[PDB]
Amino acid sequence: TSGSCKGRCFELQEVGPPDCRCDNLCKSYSSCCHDFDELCLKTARGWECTKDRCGEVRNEENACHCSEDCLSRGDCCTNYQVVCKGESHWVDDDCEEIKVPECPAGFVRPPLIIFSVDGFRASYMKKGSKVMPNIEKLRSCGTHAPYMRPVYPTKTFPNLYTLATGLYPESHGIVGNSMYDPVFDASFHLRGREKFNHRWWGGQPLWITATKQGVRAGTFFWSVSIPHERRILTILQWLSLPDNERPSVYAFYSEQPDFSGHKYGPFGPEMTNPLREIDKTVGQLMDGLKQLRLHRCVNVIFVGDHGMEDVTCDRTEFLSNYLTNVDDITLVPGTLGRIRAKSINNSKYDPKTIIAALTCKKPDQHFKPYMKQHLPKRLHYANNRRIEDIHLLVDRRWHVARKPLDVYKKPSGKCFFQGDHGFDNKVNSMQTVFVGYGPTFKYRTKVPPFENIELYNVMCDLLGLKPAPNNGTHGSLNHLLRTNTFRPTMPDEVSRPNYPGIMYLQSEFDLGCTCDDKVENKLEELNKRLHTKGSTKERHLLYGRPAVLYRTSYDILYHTDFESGYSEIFLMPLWTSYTISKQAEVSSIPEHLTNCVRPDVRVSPGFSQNCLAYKNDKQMSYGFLFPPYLSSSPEAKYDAFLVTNMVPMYPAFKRVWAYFQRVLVKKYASERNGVNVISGPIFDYNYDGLRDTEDEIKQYVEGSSIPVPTHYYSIITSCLDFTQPADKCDGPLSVSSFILPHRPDNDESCNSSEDESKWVEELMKMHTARVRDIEHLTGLDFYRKTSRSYSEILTLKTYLHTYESE
Ligand SMILES: *[C@@H]1O[C@H](CO)[C@@H](O[C@@H]2O[C@H](CO)[C@@H](O[C@H]3O[C@H](CO[C@H]4O[C@H](CO[C@H]5O[C@H](CO)[C@@H](O)[C@H](O)[C@@H]5O)[C@@H](O)[C@H](O[C@H]5O[C@H](CO)[C@@H](O)[C@H](O)[C@@H]5O[C@H]5O[C@H](CO)[C@@H](O)[C@H](O)[C@@H]5O)[C@@H]4O)[C@@H](O)[C@H](O[C@H]4O[C@H](CO)[C@@H](O)[C@H](O)[C@@H]4O[C@H]4O[C@H](CO)[C@@H](O)[C@H](O)[C@@H]4O)[C@@H]3O)[C@H](O)[C@H]2NC(C)=O)[C@H](O)[C@H]1NC(C)=O
Ligand SMILES: CC(=O)N1CCN(c2ccc3ncn(Cc4cn(Cc5ccc(Cl)c(Cl)c5)nn4)c(=O)c3c2)CC1
Ligand SMILES: [Ca+2]
Ligand SMILES: [Ca+2]
Ligand SMILES: [K+]
Ligand code: NA
Numbered sequence: 001t002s003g004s005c006k007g008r009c010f011e012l013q014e015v016g017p018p019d020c021r022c023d024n025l026c027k028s029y030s031s032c033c034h035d036f037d038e039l040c041l042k043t044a045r046g047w048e049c050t051k052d053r054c055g056e057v058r059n060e061e062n063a064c065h066c067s068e069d070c071l072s073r074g075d076c077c078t079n080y081q082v083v084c085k086g087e088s089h090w091v092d093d094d095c096e097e098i099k100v101p102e103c104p105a106g107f108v109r110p111p112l113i114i115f116s117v118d119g120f121r122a123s124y125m126k127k128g129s130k131v132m133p134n135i136e137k138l139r140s141c142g143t144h145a146p147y148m149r150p151v152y153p154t155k156t157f158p159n160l161y162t163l164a165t166g167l168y169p170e171s172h173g174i175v176g177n178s179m180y181d182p183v184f185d186a187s188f189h190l191r192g193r194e195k196f197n198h199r200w201w202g203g204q205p206l207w208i209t210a211t212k213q214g215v216r217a218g219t220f221f222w223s224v225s226i227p228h229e230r231r232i233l234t235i236l237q238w239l240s241l242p243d244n245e246r247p248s249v250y251a252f253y254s255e256q257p258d259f260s261g262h263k264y265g266p267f268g269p270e271m272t273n274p275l276r277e278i279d280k281t282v283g284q285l286m287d288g289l290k291q292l293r294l295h296r297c298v299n300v301i302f303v304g305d306h307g308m309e310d311v312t313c314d315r316t317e318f319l320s321n322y323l324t325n326v327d328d329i330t331l332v333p334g335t336l337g338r339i340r341a342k343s344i345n346n347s348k349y350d351p352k353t354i355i356a357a358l359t360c361k362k363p364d365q366h367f368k369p370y371m372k373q374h375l376p377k378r379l380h381y382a383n384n385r386r387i388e389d390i391h392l393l394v395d396r397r398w399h400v401a402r403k404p405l406d407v408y409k410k411p412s413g414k415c416f417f418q419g420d421h422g423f424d425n426k427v428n429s430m431q432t433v434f435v436g437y438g439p440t441f442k443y444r445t446k447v448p449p450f451e452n453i454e455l456y457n458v459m460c461d462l463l464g465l466k467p468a469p470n471n472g473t474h475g476s477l478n479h480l481l482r483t484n485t486f487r488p489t490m491p492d493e494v495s496r497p498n499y500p501g502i503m504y505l506q507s508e509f510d511l512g513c514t515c516d517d518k519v520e521n522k523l524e525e526l527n528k529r530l531h532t533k534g535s536t537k538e539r540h541l542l543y544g545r546p547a548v549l550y551r552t553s554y555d556i557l558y559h560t561d562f563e564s565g566y567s568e569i570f571l572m573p574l575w576t577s578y579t580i581s582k583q584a585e586v587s588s589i590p591e592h593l594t595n596c597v598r599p600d601v602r603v604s605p606g607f608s609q610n611c612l613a614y615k616n617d618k619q620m621s622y623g624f625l626f627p628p629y630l631s632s633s634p635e636a637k638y639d640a641f642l643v644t645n646m647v648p649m650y651p652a653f654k655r656v657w658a659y660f661q662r663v664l665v666k667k668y669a670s671e672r673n674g675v676n677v678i679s680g681p682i683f684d685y686n687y688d689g690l691r692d693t694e695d696e697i698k699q700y701v702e703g704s705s706i707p708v709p710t711h712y713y714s715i716i717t718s719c720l721d722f723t724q725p726a727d728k729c730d731g732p733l734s735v736s737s738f739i740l741p742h743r744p745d746n747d748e749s750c751n752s753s754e755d756e757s758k759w760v761e762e763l764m765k766m767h768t769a770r771v772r773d774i775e776h777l778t779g780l781d782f783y784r785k786t787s788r789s790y791s792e793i794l795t796l797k798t799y800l801h802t803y804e805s806e
């Protein structure tokens with residue numbers, strides 16, 4: 001329909017029907033005015049000034065200009081000043097520190113330009129260095145990480161929309177490049193028009209955050225047919241608008257190197273040219289900023305969405321080789337698998353039978369099936385109706401597909417892809433890049449790897465915006481910035497602990513427990529009282545007690561070897577803290593104590609567990625949070641069998657936990673020069689990543705009010721300088737943590753019939769976690785009392801130990 005784009009090319013506000021459009025998305029909607037190509041997508045004479053064009057008479061048909069008036073008009077070719085005025089390319093200038101923003105009059109804040117590169121694997125920064133001089137200059141002179149961790153799945157739209165919102169895909173709704181929503185009864189795909197509907201896109205992306213707070217934002221999407229040179233010239237033209245019209249935040253997107261990486265693999269020889277071409281585009285941007293005198297004013301972020309792995313058609317697993325009944329299912333295929341019933345509302349579809357048929361069926365099987373609530377909690381990939389209940393985690397370098405005909409297409413089955421991405425976000429080949437350059441970033445600074453969920457807060461800081469609620473930890477990336485506008489502070493403690501003394505006689509308890517503890521001095525009786533009053537607490541609680549950030553009733557319980565915060569509501573510790581030195585010795589549970597459980601005279605019978613419930617529950621056993629194997633003396637070992645240290649455990653899980661406690665804790669103390677361990681239960685029955693309230697618990701020990709944890713955590717801290725013992729550390733800390741699923745079987749571990757030394761540690765590594773993940777799941781706040789700055793502690797809480805090689 002009708003109108004003209006004269007005077008309207010790349011207008012910022014999109015016009016409503018029936019009026020035709022002239023903005024940078026009108027092509028995607030087939031809604032541009034008929035003269036949009038003619039007026040807005042000029043190409044005559046290409047994108048570069050030449051010597052013979054210098055000072056030309058302006059010819060408006062040209063793609064860009066070399067006329068004397070072009071700087072005033074804002075539409076010079078980006079190399080105009082170099083060719084026509086003797087200037088140097090930005091890449092050829094020495095790095096010079098940008099201590100303060102150097103901006104033209106009228107600029108109220110440094111603009112932010114986000115330059116996103118699809119499929120830019122982290123190791124391209126080294127491996128492609130010789131063909132990317134502009135990017136290497138941004139990297140070396142600005143602030144860079146060795147790599148940036150994407151979100152799972154490591155696909156384009158989930159990651160770019162995470163970058164824009166600070167949200168996990170399960171929260172922002174873009175949970176794959178393909179998705180089916182069972183309420184909409186509709187599917188979203190990379191290609192097509194359904195993804196234009198705003199019903200798919202949740203959260204608050206940066207451009208909306210900025211607009212609501214009075215900061216103008218350019219579009220972050222681009223029509224694919226608009227060439228990169230024209231995207232750069234358009235951004236530079238917008239930067240020349242009047243102050244009251246000019247955006248403060250801009251986004252450039254490149255479909256390369258991903259497009260070629262799929263065809264040629266991550267390091268195919270064909271990949272050098274796409275890297276060269278992206279570098280040239282960065283140079284056009286920087287040259288263009290330098291002409292506008294903005295190159296020491298704007299903050300530039302150069303960021304990718306995910307990496308790229310070697311993947312070929314022949315490395316495909318077929319569900320038809322496992323399932324007799326493969327026509328009953330629908331599979332979202334590829335570098336991940338998502339399975340649902342082919343016929344919705346079909347009652348003759350059993351996910352349990354499908355999982356079983358996919359579990360450990362072939363020795364080198366290259367995927368593992370999970371119910372989504374059992375996936376590693378670090379993936380945060382379950383709380384959305386668009387995530388199917390059955391998930392297949394696929395090994396790097398592989399695909400999964402339903403049937404052979406899906407992969408080998410007629411005529412005879414040629415392949416024609418060599419790279420893909422989508423795998424587990426800890427996989428090295430999926431890691432991507434981050435560089436920040438400009439006045440607000442630091443100068444020539446390396447920062448440790450971090451997660452892309454953290455960047456929304458930083459981008460808000462760079463623009464003076466208050467971030468919408470999101471999954472970043474605001475302050476954890478303050479060390480990226482020269483000038484911080486956000487001062488993080490610790491959350492206030494909500495519940496204060498009770499400190500019970502001895503209040504109950506043994507005969508008040510009727511727990512059905514027994515212990516052979518009658519066995520057998522004024523000197524060591526005082527010592528025992530001192531321990532129960534907290535005399536060793538500075539050894540075992542090294543970073544202060546955790547703060548409880550919700551309303552509850554709990555008790556602090558001191559012992560010689562461990563301290564705990566015991567919930568009178570959940571009838572078990574929320575946390576148990578203990579230090580094991582490098583010199584600590586492992587001992588057995590003595591024979592006469594195998595089934596010992598002891599009432600705790602500090603805690604009322606009515607707020608205790610009972611052994612009868614465990615006897616009656618034929619599926620459920622128990623373990624201990626402070627391990628009896630690591631008692632400091634035979635006398636202290638009796639403390640470990642208190643009813644207040646006991647937690648419900650399936651026998652299958654006790655194999656995992658006992659090996660962790662008996663073998664692995666001491667191994668870590670040996671390797672790290674002592675460790676401090678905080679362990680506890682987690683209840684997440686609705687798999688939202690957040691601590692359950694008591695009325696959300698779906699399973700109890702039979703006949704009791706003892707709730708069954710869905711997971712058990714541990715946080716294992718030591719001195720970053722391992723020449724210092726964990727309990728006498730002067731400097732920064734080192735942490736690894738896990739959130740183990742509390743499962744009644746070890747079907748996840750295909751080698752679980754072997755000795756635990758052959759599979760338990762592999763399981764724990766898969767379920768590695770950030771301290772922050774545990775905080776969300778428990779409502780606790782750790783590291784309250786250290787000598788370290790709070791921003792440093794926030795970085796520490798977001799650390800993930802991934803167990804990949806370098
Ligand atoms: C990562 O960070 C995120 C962000 O902080 C965390 O997610 C948040 O988690 C909280 C707690 O679960 C949740 O709380 C509230 O949700 C209900 C309101 O939801 C709707 O409005 C939200 C706010 O919108 C406004 O502000 C935003 C700024 O962020 C703007 O973008 C908006 O335009 C608007 O101005 C909105 O964000 C939310 O969006 C969800 O739903 C959309 C439509 O389906 C979808 O498009 C989004 O993608 C998003 O979907 C996610 O979240 C929903 C849950 O909201 C999931 O189901 C999805 O699967 C997906 O994960 C909505 O449009 C509010 O009603 C809730 O209050 C009830 O429950 C609380 C306690 O839980 C109780 O105290 C109340 O009394 C109330 O109870 C009553 O209702 C319930 C039914 O809900 C009923 O059973 C009961 O009997 C009562 O009658 C609750 O306060 C946030 O919504 C959520 N935000 C987002 C963006 O996901 C996340 O936890 C964190 N992750 C981790 C691991 O830390
Ligand atoms: C949320 C919202 O406001 N919506 C829904 C999306 N609607 C839409 C309309 C026209 C479109 N034209 C072309 N393309 C290709 C394309 C991909 N990318 C990379 C990129 C950049 C930023 C993000 Cl956040 C992400 Cl996920 C991915 N940039 N452009 C689009 O996807 C497209 C989408 C616009 C209105
Ligand atoms: Ca991508
Ligand atoms: Ca929960
Ligand atoms: K039992
Ligand atoms: Na097994």
Ligand SMILES: [Zn+2]
Nearest residue numbers: 119258262421
């Ligand atoms: Zn791709």
